[PDB]
Every structure is written in C-alpha cells, then in structure tokens.
C-alpha cells in the first residue's frame, strides 16, 4: 500500500492511542504540555486538526468511539473516563460533559456498550443479487437491552487492580455509575480487553498480567435492577500457555505486548502478541466446546517485535463457504490483521492462519487503527507523523477490472446501507472506471425494491457526486448532482409548508395536488392559467413568506440561469447540464414557479427580484413560458429536438431582458481526494493547506468581502453556512433545523 498522504507537525515517550470513527474522524493522542491533548482529524481535510484540551492529568491511555460516531471516550491513567460530545453540532468544537472516575488507571480498553444491531456481510456468496441478502442483520442482543427494548448506552472500563466500571447513561442525561471487583483474588491486570458475547451481552473481559501468567478471561453482566447499577462476575476458562513458554525456548518471549479480541462483538477469538527485546510471536486462540477450553487456532513464526496491532473493523462472515468465495474472488478486505513492527515494516495477516498477505518495507508506528472498510490505515509514526496507507481490496493482485468494480460496488453498497462513510472507498477508485461505477450504482438503485430507494434517495446522490469528483472526464457532473440535492431539499421544504384548512373530500395533500395538477392536467404554455386551475388556499402567515424570500430568490435565479444556458455558449460542458434535456427537475421547478406566483399574489415582498431591462415585462411570466416550453419538449421521452429553433431563439434573448445572475455552485472546493496521486505520496503540514492542487449556500445570504460572522463548512460538500442563525427571531425553522446536524450531503460541520 502506498501512503495516501502523510502529515507532520511543524515541530520521555508514552503509549499513544487512535480511534477511527464510523464517519471519518480520527482521534489520536499525539504525544509530542501538549502531550495531553486530543487531536481530531477530518481525514478528508488534514492540515486542520482540532486540539481539544482534554483536561486530563496522566497519559490518555484508552480512546474509543461511539458506535454511532458523535461521542468520544478518553480515559487517562488517573481514572477520568470522560465522555466527549459534539458541542452545538460541529465536528471541530468538542465539549466535555458527563463522565466518571476511579483513581486507579483504566488500562484495559474502554468499551462502549453494544446496541443490538450487529451486522453481517455475506461477502461473495451473494455479491450478485440484492441488498437484504448482501448485508444481513444478526440477532445479537444488547447490554441491559432497556426498560422498554432499546439498548442502554454506557461504557465498561476495567482498571489495574481488576475493578470494573459500568456507568450506564440514562436518557435523562445523568450517569448511573458502579464498581465491583473482577475476581475476589485481586491481581494485576496490565493488558486487557473487552468484547461482547452475543447471548444477552454477557460481555467478556479478558485480563492478563505481564508474563508467564494466565490470560484469565472473565464474564460480567449488567443489572440495572433497584434503580442502581449492579454487575455480577463469573470466571471463565483461563488460558495459560501462550504456547511460547513450553517450546523449551523459555524466556525468548516474556512479556505480552498486546491482547485484543479478534473483533469486538466477536468474542471466543483472542489475539496474543507475546514479545521480548527484539522479538515477538503472535497467536490466536479459540474457545471450543470439548467443557470449554482454549487451544491454538494459529501461530506465527518468530517476528521482529510488534509495535502496534490493528484489528479489522468490517463485519465479515467467517463461514467456510463465504471464505471460499472470498479466496476465489480475492475479496480480501475483511480478512486482515494489521501488524506493525519496530523495524519499520507493516504486515497484513490472514486472521485465521496468520500467514503474511502483504508487506510495506518503508521510525516505527506506535499506534495503528484500520478503517471501517479495510481500505485505509492510520499510523501515528514515532517521530510524530501520520500516514493513511491504502489497503487494496485485492492485495496488489491485478485481477480483472470487472472484479475490482464488483468489489468496490459491494463495499459502497454496504456503506449506503449502513450510512457510515465512503472516503476510504474513494481512495481506491481509479479515474478510469468512475463512469462505470456510477452506471452500476444507477442499476443497483433501480433494481432494489421501490421501498429502500427512499432510504437511499439522498445518499445515492452524495455517492454519485463524490465518485464523479474523480475521472476528469466527468467533473462536470458533480455540480449538477449537488444542485439536484438542493432542489430536492427546497421542493420538500416548500411542499411541506402548505398547511391548508380544507382537505376537500379525498386524500389529496396540497403538495400532491400541486404535482398532479402541474404535471398531468395543465401543461399550459402560460402562467396565470396554472394559477387558475388550483385552490388558492395556500396561506402561510405573512411572516414566514417574508422569511422565505432569500430562498425563493434562488429558485428564481436558477430558473433564469438554466434557461440562459440553453444556447450552450460555453465550449465545454457547462454547469447547468442534465437539468436540461429530459429532467423531471423541470417539472419540479415548474411546481415551485406556480407556488411562487400564488405566494407573491399575497405578499409582493417574497418574490424573486429580477433586475429587468424592460420595465413592465412581468419577468416571472416570461420565465414560466420558457420553462413550460422546455418541459413540454422534455416530458415525453425520445426527442433530441428539444432546442427547437424557436426555443433557443427565445433563450438567447434572455440576457437582453434580464441580468443572468452569478451563482455559487457548491462543490465549493476540490477535496484532498482527486488530488493525491495514483502512486506518489503527499507530504503535508498541520495547519498549512496544500499550496496548490462567501455565499452561505444554505441560506443564500451574501457574506461580504470578508465574512464578519463565524461559519461552519461541510467537510465533503464544500458548503459554508452561518453559525448563529443570523436571521431574526422570525425565521423559517424548517430549514435551519433541517441542517443543524448534518448538512444536505450528509457531512459534518466544521468551524471556519
């Protein structure tokens, strides 16, 4: 794997920590007092890293990320398991809140309690047909499961001296903390890990000493009973014998440098990396019913000592039939175990044989965490660097391009269903097959069910755009998709404000009535006849109308622009394409034009103010005439004769009758991807943008030359919007509260 990109800073050592989110946010401790600071990274925007003070007191030893993103847990070696949430929703402005404390050091992984949804990826046995059978739901249970059947949030944390801390998080917002000893014989737990056993979440807390002591697994249930947390422990089959203390090579591997359950939520498989000074040996173990007892599932030849172990995070079915077709189709991602060595190398492991799948002979990596699709790494280098290495779906094997297509399509569809993120998949998409991926996405979106297509009718556009940012043959299409997303948004927030009084007789919503009349019945070339054949009882209180002007002026300026671009003046494919030529977006715009006419007949203020050349021309009527002509030409399928000479004749006059405005376009930037290289790395700096490759896009409020007000910015969209909702107390709250979390693409906000 090549470096995606690697960025250092400008410039004793303590253990580091990193945690890659469900979305793409990395949180690494980065011990350079800025030794105790948590760094947050956007991973599609390095060079802007937020340094949370973290207010801890000893080394931040365990970091961990909520299964939903949106929450970060950091425990020190003093005991403050502190929960970091997202201050008014913004990915670069974290805030400290409810946590807990026990003065011993939380040395074992802080775990985040398991919601019921586990996952399943039937990998290539069914990487052909549909979405339900590709990505299935396994029946794992929650921890405490609820009062009423939906999991309770919380965090287990085991400390040296073998305490446990459950600390449930009540929906009320206050913690219910508890503490109880693992085993009555208190003992040293130096390296330890937590994972969750499917049956009712009887979560198992493995805990070893340092050397030649058993690894001593345990069992801890959670027991909300009596309005106070309760935890009950029972020992489990202990496992001595890392299998290196019996080969009569006695002390060649004293210490245990790592023990990590092969996957959280996948207990009954543990990885044990013994080591020494310049030596290491890793072994997996499996708890088989024989009485339960552990026995080696795989062991590795002597190795240079391991510095960091990173586990796969993508759910993959280990069934024999599935691994068979994975070996055939070479869909390697899930079957990976990233071991990082002191010499400088990085090896991937088979996860069931612990052979070597790939190497990166290339200062070692002291903290390493895989991505959520097994396509990226994050190596906090010892000197202070940070690399994002690409792990190819097939470990460098050049197998045919259709197969790479099927691999990446399967992963992207997984990311569509789970909604996690797809920046990693974007790291690998070559510029050659972006068009083909988009075509296969079109297919696999049409084919599915006509029910799930609603779930994905907003993520499909985002993935289409993020793909089309590659492949310089199709950069023209990203602007139009991010405009179609905005058009859909406006249509769904203006067809939802109607609120009539009448419901005349039948089931016909005012938006449904809008659409049915506009499309089916009155394809009249002239407005004020569409206004006639409609109920004029769309009355919003005259305050929200006035607040709606900054948006309706968009739909106005966009109709004007789209109709202006018909003569195709530009030599290249312009930035209004594909909205011409057979779009239903023409129908949507016509609906919005009719409703704007009806609105403005009530309050003239909330109309699109066009700067006209002729004084009394009724500009809206002319634009509606042009739209109707274009939509009549583009409704029925087949005719490339839409630009009938009359229509282009009318359109080429439009600069003479109005002033073609200048719009933002909302890719608003070209992200780090589509810039990296095929192979070459990209040296970066923290706080200094790569030197070379003001519109408030969600309120359409012009910030001046300089902004003078703070503003967030979508990480993937490029959008920029004002942070404090600068409109008056009277402001449409169907918009500012729609984007207050994730923006229309679906990406987090970041402060400027």
């Amino acid at each position: 794997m090549d470096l995606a990109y690697v960025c250092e800073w400008e410039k004793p050592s303590v253990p580091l920590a990193c945690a890659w989110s469900c979305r793409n946010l990395i949180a690494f401790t980065m011990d350079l007092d800025l030794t105790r600071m948590i760094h947050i990274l956007d991973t599609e925007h390095p060079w802007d890293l937020h340094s949370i003070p973290s207010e801890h007191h000893e080394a931040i030893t365990c970091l961990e990320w909520d299964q939903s993103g949106s929450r970060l847990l950091s425990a020190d070696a003093d005991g403050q398991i502190k929960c970091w949430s997202m201050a008014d929703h913004l990915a670069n402005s974290w805030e400290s809140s409810v946590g807990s404390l026990v003065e011993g050091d939380p040395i074992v992984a802080l775990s985040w309690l398991h919601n019921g949804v586990k996952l399943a990826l039937h990998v290539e046995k069914s990487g052909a047909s549909s979405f339900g059978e590709k990505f299935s739901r396994v029946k794992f249970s929650p921890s405490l499961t609820l009062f009423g059947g939906k999991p309770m949030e919380g965090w287990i944390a085991v400390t040296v001296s073998g305490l446990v801390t459950v600390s449930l998080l009540k929906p009320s917002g206050q913690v219910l903390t508890s503490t109880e000893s693992l085993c009555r014989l208190r003992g040293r737990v130096a390296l330890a890990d937590i994972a969750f056993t499917g049956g009712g979440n009887i979560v198992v807390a493995t805990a070893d000493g340092s050397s030649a002591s058993p690894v001593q697994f345990y069992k801890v249930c959670v027991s909300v009973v009596s309005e106070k947390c309760r935890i009950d422990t029972e020992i489990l089959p202990s496992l001595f014998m890392r299998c290196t203390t019996d080969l009569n090579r006695k002390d060649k591997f004293p210490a245990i440098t790592h023990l990590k359950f092969l996957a959280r939520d996948m207990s009954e498989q543990v990885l044990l990396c013994a080591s020494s000074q310049t030596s290491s040996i890793v072994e997996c173990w499996s708890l088989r019913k024989e009485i339960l007892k552990w026995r080696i599932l795989s062991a590795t030849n002597d190795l240079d000592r391991v510095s960091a172990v990173a586990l796969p995070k993508l759910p993959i079915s280990l069934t024999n039939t599935d691994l068979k077709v994975a070996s055939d189709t070479q869909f390697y991602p899930g079957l990976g175990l990233a071991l990082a060595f002191h010499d400088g190398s990085v090896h991937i492991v088979h996860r069931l044989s612990l052979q070597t799948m790939a190497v990166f002979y290339s200062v070692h990596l002291k903290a390493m965490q895989l991505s959520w699709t097994s396509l990226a790494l994050v190596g906090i280098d010892s000197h202070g660097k940070l690399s994002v290495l690409r792990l190819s779906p097939s470990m460098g094997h050049p197998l045919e391009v259709g197969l790479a297509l099927r691999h990446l399509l399967f992963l992207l569809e997984y990311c569509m269903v789970t909604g996690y993120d797809w920046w990693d998949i974007l790291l690998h998409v070559q510029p050659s097959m972006v068009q083909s991926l988009v075509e296969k996405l079109h297919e696999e979106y049409t084919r599915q069910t006509a029910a799930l297509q609603q779930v994905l009718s907003t993520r499909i556009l985002a993935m289409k755009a993020s793909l089309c940012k590659l492949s310089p043959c199709t950069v023209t299409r990203v602007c139009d998709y991010h405009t179609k997303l905005f058009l859909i948004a406006i249509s769904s927030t203006l067809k939802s404000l109607l609120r009539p009084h009448f419901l005349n007789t039948p089931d016909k919503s005012p938006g449904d009535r809008l659409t049915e009349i506009c499309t089916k019945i009155t394809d009249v070339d002239i407005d004020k006849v569409m206004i006639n054949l409609k109920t004029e009882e769309f009355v919003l209180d005259m305050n929200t109308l006035q607040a709606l002007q900054q948006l309706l002026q968009w739909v106005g300026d966009f109709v004007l622009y789209l109709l202006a671009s018909l003569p195709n003046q530009g030599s290249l494919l312009r930035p209004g394409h594909s909205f011409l030529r057979d779009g239903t977006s023409l129908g949507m715009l016509r609906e919005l034009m009719v409703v704007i006419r009806i609105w403005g007949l009530l309050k003239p203020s909330c109309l699109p103010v066009y700067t006209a050349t002729s004084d009394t021309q009724d500009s809206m009527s002319l634009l509606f005439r042009l739209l109707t002509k274009l939509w009549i030409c583009c409704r029925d399928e087949g005719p490339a004769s839409e630009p009938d000479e009359a229509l282009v004749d009318e359109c080429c006059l439009l600069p003479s009758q109005l002033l073609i405005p200048s719009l933002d376009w909302l890719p608003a930037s070209d992200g780090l991807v589509s810039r990296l290289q095929p192979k070459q790395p990209l040296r970066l700096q923290f706080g200094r943008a790569p030197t070379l490759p003001k519109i408030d896009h969600l309120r359409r409020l012009h910030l001046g030359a300089c902004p003078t007000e703070e503003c967030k910015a979508c990480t993937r969209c490029g959008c920029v919007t004002m942070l404090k909702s600068p409109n008056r107390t009277t402001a449409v709250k169907q918009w500012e509260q729609r984007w207050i979390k994730n923006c229309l693409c679906g990406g987090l906000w970041w402060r400027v």
Binding site: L659, S662, H702, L703, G704, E709
Partner: protein
Amino acid sequence: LCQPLLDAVLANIRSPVFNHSLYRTFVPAMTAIHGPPIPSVLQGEVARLDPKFLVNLDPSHCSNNGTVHLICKLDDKDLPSVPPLELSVPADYPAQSPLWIDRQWQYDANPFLQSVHRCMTSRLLQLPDKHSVTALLNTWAQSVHQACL
C-alpha cells in the same frame, strides 16, 4: 445631499444581514455598468562605532536573556590604556540607560586611575536620561582624555 444615505447606512450597521442588504441592492447595478472586478539594535550601535572602542560581549554571563553584558576596552593611539569598562544594557533600551559597574577594586591604586574615576562618575551623572551605549563610551573617552589633562 448625503444625509439620506448617511442615516440609512448608519441605521442598520448592527444587523447580521447588513452585508446581504448591501450586496443585493448595489452589486447588480455596479456589475451592470462596471464589468466584473542579541537585541539587534545594540548590534547596530556596536557596528557603527569608532574603531578605538573595540567592544566584545562579556565571557561571563550568558547574553541570551533580555540583557546582554559588554566588556569594552579602550584603545586609540593617543590614549593611555586603562581598565576596561563593563557595560550592561537594559534590553528595554532604548529609553533605558545602560548601567555602569562601579568598583574601587578597579581604581584605587594610583592617582591617574582615581582621577579617571572622579571625572567619569561626574560626567556620567550629567548625562541626560536617555543614554545610548555610544553616549557611555564617548563619555568614557572624554574622561580618560580629561584625566590626561
């Protein structure tokens, strides 16, 4: 005639949509008619001196911290060689007089030296409120010379 725009603009300076109001009303027309748009100061004074006053920085102390000490030793063929003068600059200098280091351990023995000291302390006391290293060293030269009388 400017009063209408004056009070109009002054009316809404606070509004957070003031920039949008300014842009909406004006930018269309304006695009319609106009188209698209060591303290290193002491280094200087030490550089520009007269050759006779060869000045180096004190081997004792660490000139690194705010004030650099100096060990300057008169030369000049006309004069009589005397004891060195150890300077200290209050890094806030200029507008800060550079201290002198008084010591009878230097001058006590002989008459020429004690006369030098008398003349030096008097003239330095006279020097006004704004001494620059050049002022100290010049005063010292005049003192040596006047003691040679």
